[PDB]
Symmetry: C3
Amino acid sequence: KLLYTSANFLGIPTNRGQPKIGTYQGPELIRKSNFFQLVAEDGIQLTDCGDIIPVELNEAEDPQRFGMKWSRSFSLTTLRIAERVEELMKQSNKSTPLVIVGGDHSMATGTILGHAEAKPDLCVLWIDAHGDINTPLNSASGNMHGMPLSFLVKELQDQIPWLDDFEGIKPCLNASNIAYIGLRDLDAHETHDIRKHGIAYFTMLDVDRMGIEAVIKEALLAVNPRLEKAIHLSFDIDALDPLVAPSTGTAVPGGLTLREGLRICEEVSATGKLSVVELAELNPLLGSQEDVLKTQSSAVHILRACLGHCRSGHLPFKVRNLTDQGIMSRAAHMQ
Amino acid sequence: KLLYTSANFLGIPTNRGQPKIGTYQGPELIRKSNFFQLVAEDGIQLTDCGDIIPVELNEAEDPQRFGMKWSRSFSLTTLRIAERVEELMKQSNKSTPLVIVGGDHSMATGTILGHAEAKPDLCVLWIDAHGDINTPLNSASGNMHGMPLSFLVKELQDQIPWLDDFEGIKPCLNASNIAYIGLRDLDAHETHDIRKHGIAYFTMLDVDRMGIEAVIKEALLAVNPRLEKAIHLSFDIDALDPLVAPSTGTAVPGGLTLREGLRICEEVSATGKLSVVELAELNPLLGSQEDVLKTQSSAVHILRACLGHCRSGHLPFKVRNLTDQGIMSRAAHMQ
Amino acid sequence: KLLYTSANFLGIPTNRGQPKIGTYQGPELIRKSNFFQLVAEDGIQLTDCGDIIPVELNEAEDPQRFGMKWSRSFSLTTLRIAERVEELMKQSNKSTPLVIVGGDHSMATGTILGHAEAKPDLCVLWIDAHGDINTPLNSASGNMHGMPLSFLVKELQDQIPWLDDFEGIKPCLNASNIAYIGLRDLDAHETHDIRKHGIAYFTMLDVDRMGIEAVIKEALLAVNPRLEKAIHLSFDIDALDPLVAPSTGTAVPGGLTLREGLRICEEVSATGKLSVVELAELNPLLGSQEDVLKTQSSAVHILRACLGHCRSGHLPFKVRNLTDQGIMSRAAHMQ
Ligand SMILES: N[C@](CCCC[B-](O)(O)O)(CCN1CCCCC1)C(=O)O
Ligand SMILES: N[C@](CCCC[B-](O)(O)O)(CCN1CCCCC1)C(=O)O
Ligand SMILES: N[C@](CCCC[B-](O)(O)O)(CCN1CCCCC1)C(=O)O
Ligand SMILES: [Mn+2]
Ligand SMILES: [Mn+2]
Ligand SMILES: [Mn+2]
Ligand SMILES: [Mn+2]
Ligand SMILES: [Mn+2]
Ligand SMILES: [Mn+2]
């Protein structure tokens, strides 16, 4: 009756991928919610595997290199994440999805690296207002959370500066293994690289013209045609409209409705191939108390959909009967 | 020019169907609005028939029975509502719609009972995030507003515990006479009963995949194929997204847009078969002042659509002419 | 690579078309934003042409005439606007769009008058919750911002009272040159005139049933079939849902989503025929600080779309290369 009967939960409180303090509280925002209770109510055994501890160096240890901010904290954290995800995914070999809560999106380099170590032929569905595929010299901001895919994509490696501490970060993705949904604020050089190397992408313009149902279908068609590959679903909460997810660092108006977001996750879940889902860029320190509650709520509904929650309802495990308790029913009484 | 030239208005301030104080202020929230003025401006004669006084017993008189909270207050209130609705609907036999403002949704047992007494072959369109069809032993909450349909549906009576004071509450609905729109938070046993007895239902997943236009059509097709039956439209305000109706007790993210809600009401109205519309679960004591204003506004637009308001405009009753006032026009002056 | 490489920007702080103080701050709300910076980042040369100074008479000089409030301030302002727009549009003869920020919508009589002087065969796309086509004796409010089209439409001139100071305001539009999108709160006499004279209109009901893609297509088909005519896009910010544009004087629930608004502007822009776009009814003195920020944001995204911003991204003018800086890439290092 369930596609996934077990799941693992991992927190990754990354906060050195971008300058706004608070993404480190992301995992706790979800733990404080009713997520676990709701998942159990659906019959799923969810194991909290704790948090990864990011490496956070001081300024002296981690100066700017090629404009990148905290790049050694990044490289060390990436390797620590990858090791943990790899070992979690290998104990998993009905499959057992890994649910990851961030943390800023710089964590994705590590999670995908480790995931691909366990499952080399995976595909990536990237749900985001942003491309997150800036190579270091093209990044105006120097924020690592805008670069995580660039280190992973083989076709881009002539645009990545060599750093010794980045050697263990091996490019494990082909451009043909990635599909974007939700884009609406690409940098020019991202647009260039995406089009040049033929990365499948469906922006909010595409969602408007095609509808989310067709977009989801085409995205899966592009990178997982016959559902042969494990899916890495990388969900940036800022893919959703700021009206439903205001508490995040780089919000952009005109996003996915919660319903559109749910449809993406419902379809990905229903493939039976959801291997890892990560939810990035929750920041409970941004916005009002009600803003945080809305963002939390949206996140929980999204993550539930990923694990197979159905808005059309679930059947009970044991159907209750009235006579079993020795109780007279109205139907019984009338006869 | 008008499908309905007259209408009746009834308040039912039920608040013993659920524990949050404030649904009793629902009718006043609408009376305080510009609803009446706007309805008159469309040429409709709307008569305020006052409020039904719910029976509210004290704890000693109304202890828990079969887990139900305030079940004798419920049974007595149900009978009082039914008597009033029946007499209102029988004076009505262009038909004259009855507009009912709640009050929590437990009132629906009474309104439908009385309605069916006047019009036995009616159908029910239930617009709600919830099923409201829990039988008493399956209800974790014991809140009557989550059970009103269960006492009315004939196929469910082997699951209703017999109570003497419930005898006058006769099941008057076949499962085939009900269609849901907007569901997104069903209890497992509700899901079971709905599927088992073939109740037509269109959840938010269905709305996403089909679109609201097709959903409305299919819902009417399922329970009123040739528009032969009077329609009881039971509209829970929490069917709408919390962004447009935050002031309600059990809000669930990812609801109908106001526009989707308007389309439901516009189509139901246009059948010429709208016999009763009830609007449930307004709670002006929940949320901020602006939250209440939004919910009020959404409710007024919804109720106006039910009575035939057209967003594409109405024609004037008397067309004004310039020369009638003895005034020189620009066209006149240029000649 | 760009449809429009240059554009002009004009502020018109009209505030005598309606009684709520604050629309005069509209132009500054946009100047304070990052609009100019973002437009430049797309490669467009935008020239700020300053503000038009409206004529604002005192009460003694400008008493009510035919129920109209501030009608001489209106007639004088209209002529001053028209002169300025005409001279701006004639210096413009890749064309150079004129972007106008209001100001209440009464400015439209002046902007269209001047525009048509430069381009007599123009068409008008009116994006609004309201018709703004009340003739003076039918207007209950007397607010000029609800009448600007009535003075321009030739077919309506037998319903316009003659005033000497209105002589220079010559009707320059045929009813067949106008198409509405977004209507949802028409006055009865507006509905009458619109239907009587066959003005193309697509209300929110039409948007719901047809979808915005079809609506845009049909609107352009109705008034600009072969893209032969210059387009005057008159965008009332209250066309958008109050959830995304709360800071405006006459907000009506159930409006266009920001995305739907963007699609309108994206398609109009892509015709290559966008000649003038005006954005009306911004009022930074209404609503909360966050309300103003949302409205500002929505306005900037809308105006950017008009000038050709693409949500699917732009290509860089110069593609950056790694070796040009004398830097070793990862690809280089591995060989
Ligand atoms: N691409 C940006 C944003 C990165 C956000 C990372 B995410 O998706 O985890 O929140 C810069 C975006 N860009 C900035 C200026 C104007 C256009 C968009 C960057 O800093 O590289
Ligand atoms: N079905 C619920 C909600 C009833 C709401 C009545 B309405 O539609 O008038 O507002 C309980 C819902 N349920 C609770 C736990 C998790 C799943 C949903 C119940 O209490 O029976
Ligand atoms: N049509 C109205 C609104 C004008 C708004 C001008 B805009 O689009 O620049 O904001 C009156 C609307 N009308 C009022 C009563 C009920 C129905 C709608 C008027 O005052 O003429
Ligand atoms: Mn992002
Ligand atoms: Mn991201
Ligand atoms: Mn409900
Ligand atoms: Mn209900
Ligand atoms: Mn308007
Ligand atoms: Mn207007």
